[PDB]
Amino acid sequence: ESYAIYVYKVLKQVHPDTGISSKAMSIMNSFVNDVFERIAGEASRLAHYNKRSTITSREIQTAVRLLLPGELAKHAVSEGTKAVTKYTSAKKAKTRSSRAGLQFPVGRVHRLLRKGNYAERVGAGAPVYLAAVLEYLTAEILELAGNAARDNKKTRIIPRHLQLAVRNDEELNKLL
């Protein structure tokens, strides 16, 4: 699956005048896919472990806490919870992503959660929470990689900046 356009939207929110090379975008897309699969897979195991037939934001949250190291997990849980509470309230919003306050695609995440046979059913809150987490991790990686680019007087993120950002961050290194 391609998340490149959403990675770009997030990049513009953290580093508005920094670009990303074709190879660096491909690496980001691979990161997003890998994390999606790992969280959805763990949510699936948790649903089965708890004899639930529906994946909801509860199983996504616990999956996220199991997979993500300390601080990343705290911030991810904060953003996923926020997205769900906003989505519940914001009935006059025009799209599911906008209802959640997100750049990442809530509808596509929902479709992929269903397509992956992670459980019999998927609740409306699950893709909101997961999309918010994917967006948060993307934003963190792009913040750091864009800082590396700037520190090297480059106007775009290239693969070596992603490597520096991820490998020199204890928690991202563990995650990725």
Amino- and carboxy-terminal Cα gap: 18 Å
* Secondary-structure element series: HEHEHHHHEHEHH
User: Roughly how much helix do the residues carry, as a percent range?
Assistant: over 70%
Strand order of the largest sheet: 1-4
β content, as a range? under 5%
CATH class: Mainly Alpha
Number of helices: 9
CATH superfamily: Histone, subunit A
Which CATH architecture?
Orthogonal Bundle
- Structural domains: how many: 1
- Overall body shape: globular
Radius of gyration: 16 Å
Structural class by helix and strand composition: mainly alpha
User: CATH fold name, please?
Assistant: Histone, subunit A
**Number of strand elements:** 4
Q: How is the main sheet built?
A: 2 strands, parallel
Describe the structure in your own words.
The protein is mainly alpha-helical. Helix 1 packs across helix 7 (125-151), helix 4 (70-89) crosses helix 7 and helix 6 crosses helix 7 (125-151). Strands 1-4 form a two-stranded parallel ribbon. Helix content is 72%, strand content 5%. It has nine helices and four strands; from the N terminus they run H-E-H-E-H-H-H-H-E-H-E-H-H. The chain has one domain (1-176): Orthogonal Bundle (Histone, subunit A), CATH 1.10.20. The chain has helices spanning 4-14, 22-49, 57-67, 70-89, 96-99, 106-115, 125-151, 159-167, 170-175, and strands spanning 19-20, 54-55, 121-122, 156-157. The chain is globular and about 50 Å long. This is Histone H2B 1.1. It is found in: Nucleus; Chromosome.
